[PDB]
Amino acid sequence: AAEFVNFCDSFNIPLVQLVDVPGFLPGVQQEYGGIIRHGAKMLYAYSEATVPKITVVLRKAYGGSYLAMCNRDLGADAVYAWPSAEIAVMGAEGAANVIFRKEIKAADDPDAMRAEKIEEYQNAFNTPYVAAARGQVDDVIDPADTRRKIASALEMYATKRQTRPAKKHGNFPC
Amino acid sequence: LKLASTMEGRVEQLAEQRQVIEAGGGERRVEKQHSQGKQTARERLNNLLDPHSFDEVGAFRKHRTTLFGMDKAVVPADGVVTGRGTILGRPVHAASQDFTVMGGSAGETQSTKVVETMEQALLTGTPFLFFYDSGGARIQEGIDSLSGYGKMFFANVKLSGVVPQIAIIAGPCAGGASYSPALTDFIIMTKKAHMFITGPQVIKSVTGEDVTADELGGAEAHMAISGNIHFVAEDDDAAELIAKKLLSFLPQNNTEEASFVNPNNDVSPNTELRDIVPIDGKKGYDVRDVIAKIVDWGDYLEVKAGYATNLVTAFARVNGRSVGIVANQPSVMSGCLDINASDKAAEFVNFCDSFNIPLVQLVDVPGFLPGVQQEYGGIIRHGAKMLYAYSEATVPKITVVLRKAYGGSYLAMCNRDLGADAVYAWPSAEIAVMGAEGAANVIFAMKIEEYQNAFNTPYVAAARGQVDDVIDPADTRRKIASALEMYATKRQTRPAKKHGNFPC
Amino acid sequence: LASTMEGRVEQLAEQRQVIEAGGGERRVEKQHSQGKQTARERLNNLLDPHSFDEVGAFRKHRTTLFGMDKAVVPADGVVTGRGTILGRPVHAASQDFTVMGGSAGETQSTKVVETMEQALLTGTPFLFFYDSGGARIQEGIDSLSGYGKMFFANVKLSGVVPQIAIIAGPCAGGASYSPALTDFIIMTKKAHMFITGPQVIKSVTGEDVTADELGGAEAHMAISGNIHFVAEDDDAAELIAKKLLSFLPQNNTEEASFVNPNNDVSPNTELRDIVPIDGKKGYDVRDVIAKIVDWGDYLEVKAGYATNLVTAFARVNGRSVGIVANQPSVMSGCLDINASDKAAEFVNFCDSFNIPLVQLVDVPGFLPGVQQEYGGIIRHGAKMLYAYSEATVPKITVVLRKAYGGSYLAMCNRDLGADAVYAWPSAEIAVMGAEGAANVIFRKEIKAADDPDAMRAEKIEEYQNAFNTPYVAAARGQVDDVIDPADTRRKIASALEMYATKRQTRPAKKHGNFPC
Amino acid sequence: GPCAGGASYSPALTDFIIMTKKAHMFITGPQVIKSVTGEDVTADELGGAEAHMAISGNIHFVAEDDDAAELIAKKLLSFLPQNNTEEASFVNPNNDVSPNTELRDIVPIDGKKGYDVRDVIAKIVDWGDYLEVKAGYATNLVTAFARVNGRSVGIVANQPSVMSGCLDINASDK
C-alpha cells in the first residue's frame, strides 16, 4: 500500500480508498517481523501525500488499520460511509466486556446486561451515523451512489493545493 | 469547581488544585508505578529537562467525553503531561504519558494535547520528546480515542525530518498507539516497557499462541528481532541519559547543523589504526575499535546496537562536529549486508541527511548475505534502500574503504558514484565487482592472481579515480577531518520533486 | 438498523429527510411567512441545479450541558458543502434559523471553518448565507471559541479566494464580524445586524432605536458603511451574488474569465456632452461609465454609501474592471472620509484579485469640514493613496475634469503608478485652483494694482494657462495624451489590452501598514 | 511646524507621527472651512497636536517641543529594528522574573471596580519602562512598547478605568 500511495503522490495521481479492514493480522511473526515499522509506512505515505485522497468505508474500519487506510485525520479530503460502515476503536462485544466487566459479573442476570451493554456501545460509537456525527465521515451514503460520490470529490479536489513543512524529506519508515 | 472569595484565597485554591492534578492517579497508583521500577510522568520530565525549565501546558486541560462514565471521571491532565523545557539550555517540547491516570489510555483530549505540543515544536523549530506509558486506546471514548491517534500520526509525519522526534517507551504501549513511536526518529525503550500492535490476548484467541507481553514486545524483542527500536534502557534514569546523549548530536531543526560539542582538534597520526584490520581477510574484528580511534575522545553513541549487528550505525564527532558513521561489522556474519542491516543503514542515512549530519562510511563488506530467505524476504528492495538513501543524500559523504568492498554491497556503502565526496582506500582495501576467484573462474591448472592485481588492488581503484588516495590507516582521522572541513560548505542541487520513491 | 442493505438504504433516506426538514414544518412555515427562504432553499437557488454536494448533514454537536445532551439539532444548524455557480466550483454555507434559532453552535462553526478551509485548499470562492439569532448560550465558551475560529478563517481566506456573505436574517453580536471579514456583504431587507442590540443600548445608554433603524440593511448601507449590496429578498440576494461572482476569478492566482465581450470600440460623440464645460455644473458620472463599458452594464458596489464616489464592476471587451469615479453631482465630487474608505476597500479588493482599475476623475478636493478633520480625513484619505500606491494591477486613469491637489493623487495619477493617464480637453489637473493660486502668489501685485479686479483676472488667467490646462499636464508628462472624449472607450480598452501582460512587483514585506 | 493640506498624507503614510505643540496639521484650514461650512475653529483647535491626538486619531505622540520630540523619536526608535528582516536589538535587559505578589492586588476581585492596567504593565516589563503609543487617544485601550528580558514587545491592554475597558471604534483602530 505504502509504495503505491507514495508513487501516486509523486506523480499527482489521486488516491481512492475502499475500506473493509478488521485490524492488523494477529500473529507472533507479524510482531517479530516489525509490523510496527512496516504498518507505519502506510500512515506515513498517506500523511505525507498531498494529492486528493478520497476514502469510502464499505464495512469494517477497526483501530489503527482504519487510520492506515487514510481517514480524515490522515488528510483524506472526503470520506464517505456506506450504511454498513463500522468505524471503531474496538468491537462492541469486546468493549462492553471490559467497560462493564464488574457490572456484568455482579449482575443477577449477566447475559441480559452484557447484551444490553454491547448494543449500547455498538449504537454509541460503531454505526455510520456516529462516525458522521463526529465528522469522521462527510456523509453516510447509499452504496449505489459510490461512483458519483468519488467522482464529485475528485472533480472538486482537482484544484487542491496543499503545503507541507519545508524539509529535504521526511523519515520514511524502513 | 467554585472560585474562592479572595485573590490570595484563589491563589491558594489554584495551588491546591494544581497539586491535585499533579498527583495524577493517586498515591496508591503512584506507589504501584514506583514499585515497578518506574518514575511517574512528571518525574520523567523533571529528570529529562533542566532544573525548573518545565513550563507545562494543559495541566488543567480536561476530556470532553461523557459516555460510559467519562462524564463523571476525574482524569488529571487527561493522562499526559505536556510542555516546553530546555535540555542543556536547548529549548525542547515534550509530552509524558501518565499511566496512573486511566492506565494512560489515549484519551481524545490527551492526543490533542500531544499534537498541540508537537505543532508548537514544529512552529518554533525545536525537538520533541515523548515518554509513552499507556495501556492503549480509551475504549470508553470509542472513535474519539481512535481519531486522536490519527491526528497524532499525521503530526508525527508533519514534524518528520523537520525537528528531531524522540520517543521513550517507559511502560506499556499497546496497540496502534505504537505507530506514533514508529513515526518518530528514535525510540528508546526501557526494560520495564512492552509494545506491540496486536497483544497476547488477541494473539492467543486468534492464533492459539499463548505468549507473554514481554516475550511478544519487550525491549529485547523489539531491538533484536523486530528492528523497531533504537536503544534499550535499563530503566527510566538510563533512558533519560540516552535521550540527552542522543539529542546532543542533533540540531534543533533541519535548518541547522548540530552545534559542535567539546571538539578535539588534534588529528595527528594514530598508528593503532594500522593494527585493527587484519591483513588476513578470514579474520574479523570489531569495527567499533576503528571508529573509537577516529572520532573525538573515542566517544560514539551506537544506534540500534543490538539489531543487525553485522552493520554498525553510530553518532560520533570529528573536531566537535556530529557525524553519522555507517560501518560493516566483519566480526558478525562476515560483515555481510542483509535485509535487516540494509534497513538499519538506510534509516540512519536518511535521518542524518534530513538533519544535515555528515555521513562517514567505514567499508569492509564481502557482499550481501547469501540465503533463500534473503531473496524471498526481498533483499532486492531492502538493499535498494541503502542505494536510494545514499544517492538521495546531500550531506557530506566521506567513505573509507578499510578492506573488502565487493560488488553491490560496496556501492551500497556509498562510493563516489553514489555521491561520496571523498573516498579513501586503506592499503588493505579490496574494491572488486567480484572476488578474484569466481571472476576468473567465470571469465575463464591455469588466472585468479592476474585478475586480482589487475582490478582488486587499492591502486587500481585509485588508478580509475574510484578512490581519491590510498592512505596510511594511521592518517584516517586527519583525512576524514580535512574532508569534513572542506565539504562543510557543500551545496548540492537535486531535481525538484515532492519526494523520490523510497523502496519499501 | 435494517437487516438488508436495501433496508438500511431506506433507513438512510428517512433519516436524511428528517435532517433536511431542519427545525420542522412549523418553523419552516414561520421562516417562509417572514418572506425568507430556508437554509436549504437558499443553497438550492444559488447553486446550479442539483449541484449541491453536502458535507456533514449528519454532523452533530458534542456538547452536553444545559439540555444539549438531549437536543436534536439537525446539521447543527448550518448546511455546508460545495456546488457550482454557472459551472464554477464554489463552497458554501447556509445557517439554518429553524434549528435552535441558527445559534452558533461550536460544531456549526467548525463545519463552516472546515468548508472555508476546503475553499482555500481548492482555491474556490466561498459564499455564506447568515441567518442566526446569535451565540448558542447553552454551549458557553465552546460557542465563543467557534466564532474565533471562524474569524481567523475569514482572515486566512482574505485576498486568496473571494468571500461573499449574504445576510438573510438576524446576524446579532460579534457574529457580524465574520461578514465584515469577507469581501462583500449582500444584505436583504429582512435581515438585521449589529454588535450590541437595541435592548442593551437602551439599558446602557438610554437611546431608543428599533432593530430596523439600528441594523437594518438601509442603515448599514448608507450610514455604517458596512455592506456592499442591499437585496429586496433572498431571490434578489441570490441574483446579486451570482452577478457579483461573475466579475471575480476563482482565486488570487487568476484573472476573471471574460464574459460576453463587446469588442466594438467605436467613438461615441455623445460622451463629449455628458461632462459640462461649465465647471460649476454637475452630471452623473455613471452616464460616462455606461457609455464606455460593455453593453452599458455595471454592478455598482456600495451604491447607497458615500455616493460622492462611485465604485463599480464592469467589463471592457469582456474583461472585468473595477471603476472608481468621482460623482460631481454629489457633494461636488469631493472625496471625504467615507468615500475614502469606500474607494480604498474596492481598490484593495480589485488588486487582490487581479482586476484592473479604471479611474474617471473629476474631483475638486476633499470635503471641507471640522468633522472631516476631527474624523481623521488625514488617515482615511491616506487609505486611497496607500491602496493605489500598493496596487499592481493595471491602473488606467482618465481625467474628465477637475483633478485638484491630493484628491487627484488619491484618484491614482502617474506618480501613484497609473499605467496610462488620459486627459479630456476639460481636464484640470492642478496643485490648486487658478483663483486660489493667483490670489496667493500675486497677493501683493493685485493689492497694489491700479485696478485690482482686472489684475486678479489677469493673474488668474495667467496661472490657469501656465499650469492648469490638459496641455500643461501633457507637457509635463502627467498625462499620456489629451483625448477626444468620444474616444474614451477605445483609449481605455487599448490601455487595458496593452497592460494585460503587466507584471509589477513590490518590496518584500509581510504587509505594508495600511492606514486605520 | 505647519503641515498644511495634502502634505499631511505623507506623515499619515509613515508609521509614527510625533507632533510638537508648535505644529499644526489639517487637510482643509480654518479659512476654507469657515467659507464652505461656516464653522468656526482656530488652527490650534482644528489641527494642533492635542486635537490630532485625542480627537482625530492621526498621531502617535505629542511632544512639548523639538527637544522633547527628538527624545521621543530616539526612545521610539530604540524599540525598532533597522528593517523588517530583523528583530530589534535588545536593550538593557533585566532578566529577573522573580514573582511579584503586588500583581495579585492591582486587579480588584470586585468586577465593578477598575484600575490602571499600566500598573500591571509596569510590574511585568523591564524596569517598569514603557513608551505608550497614542497615549491620549482611545484611552480605553493601551498600546505601548516595552521590553521583557531586553526584547522589544508591543503591549495591548484594556483599560478598565476608562469606559469600563470596553473596546469601541477608536480603540479598535488604535
Coordinates of C-alpha atoms in Angstrom, one line a residue, chain A residues 44 47-50 162-171, chain B residues 118-125 154-163 165 253-255 354-355 497-499:
Chain A
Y44 CA 3.5 7.9 6.7
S47 CA 0.0 11.6 5.9
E48 CA 2.7 12.9 3.6
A49 CA 0.6 12.6 0.4
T50 CA -0.8 15.9 -0.9
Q162 CA -1.6 21.7 -0.1
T163 CA 1.5 22.9 1.6
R164 CA 4.0 20.8 3.5
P165 CA 6.7 21.9 6.0
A166 CA 10.0 22.6 4.2
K167 CA 12.3 19.6 4.5
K168 CA 14.8 17.6 2.5
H169 CA 12.5 14.7 3.1
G170 CA 10.6 13.1 6.0
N171 CA 11.9 10.0 7.6
Chain B
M118 CA 4.1 18.8 18.6
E119 CA 2.7 21.7 16.5
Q120 CA 4.4 24.0 18.9
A121 CA 7.7 22.2 18.4
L122 CA 7.3 22.4 14.6
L123 CA 6.2 26.1 14.9
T124 CA 9.3 27.0 17.0
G125 CA 11.7 24.6 15.3
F154 CA -0.4 12.8 11.0
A155 CA 1.5 15.2 13.3
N156 CA 4.5 12.8 13.7
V157 CA 4.8 12.7 9.9
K158 CA 4.4 16.5 9.6
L159 CA 7.3 17.0 12.1
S160 CA 9.3 14.2 10.4
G161 CA 12.6 15.5 9.0
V162 CA 11.9 19.0 10.3
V163 CA 12.6 18.7 14.0
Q165 CA 11.4 13.4 17.4
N253 CA 15.7 21.5 13.4
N254 CA 16.5 20.9 9.8
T255 CA 17.7 24.4 9.0
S354 CA 17.5 15.1 7.0
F355 CA 19.3 16.8 9.8
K497 CA 10.2 16.5 -6.7
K498 CA 7.7 16.0 -3.9
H499 CA 9.9 13.1 -3.0

